């Protein structure tokens, strides 16, 4: 799983780009569904602040 850390500025750019729709808007920051994430790294590639990190 990747997890979006506290650097997220809630820009929303990563949500459309997840190939398996694992990202949604949450309170404070966006959230990854760890039961769907397949570690592709796409969200980190479109993140301006590089908040998604592999855990
Ligand atoms: S790593 Fe890939 S599968 Fe996991 S949330 Fe980011 S874009 Fe979606
Ligand atoms: S692209 Fe980065 S800052 Fe923008 S919502 Fe996704 S994780 Fe947060």
From Swiss-Prot:
Annotated SUPFAM superfamilies: 4Fe-4S ferredoxins
A Pfam family reported for this protein in Swiss-Prot or TrEMBL: Fer4_7
GO CC terms: cytoplasm
GO molecular function, one term: electron transfer activity
PROSITE patterns, sorted: 4FE4S_FER_1 (PS00198), 4FE4S_FER_2 (PS51379)
Amino-acid positions noted as binding [4Fe-4S] cluster 1 in the UniProt annotation, renumbered to this chain: 8, 11, 14, 47
Domain of life of the source: Bacteria
InterPro entries attached to this UniProt entry: 4Fe4S_Fe-S-bd, 4Fe4S_Fe_S_CS, 7Fe_ferredoxin, PSI_iron-sulfur_center
Domain 4Fe-4S ferredoxin-type residue range list: 1-27, 28-55
Alphabetized UniProt keyword annotations: 4Fe-4S, Electron transport, Iron, Iron-sulfur, Metal-binding, Repeat, Transport
Entry binding sites for [4Fe-4S] cluster 2: 18, 37, 40, 43
Cofactors required: [4Fe-4S] cluster
Cofactor binding notes: Binds 2 [4Fe-4S] clusters.
Free-text function comment from the UniProt entry: Ferredoxins are iron-sulfur proteins that transfer electrons in a wide variety of metabolic reactions.
Protein name listed in UniProt: 4Fe-4S ferredoxin FdxA
């Amino acid at each position: 799983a990747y997890v979006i850390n506290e650097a997220c500025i809630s820009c929303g750019a990563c949500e459309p780009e997840c190939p398996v729709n694992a990202i949604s808007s949450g309170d404070d920051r966006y959230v990854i569904d760890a039961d769907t994430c397949i570690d592709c790294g796409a969200c980190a590639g479109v993140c301006p602040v590089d908040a998604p990190v592999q855990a």
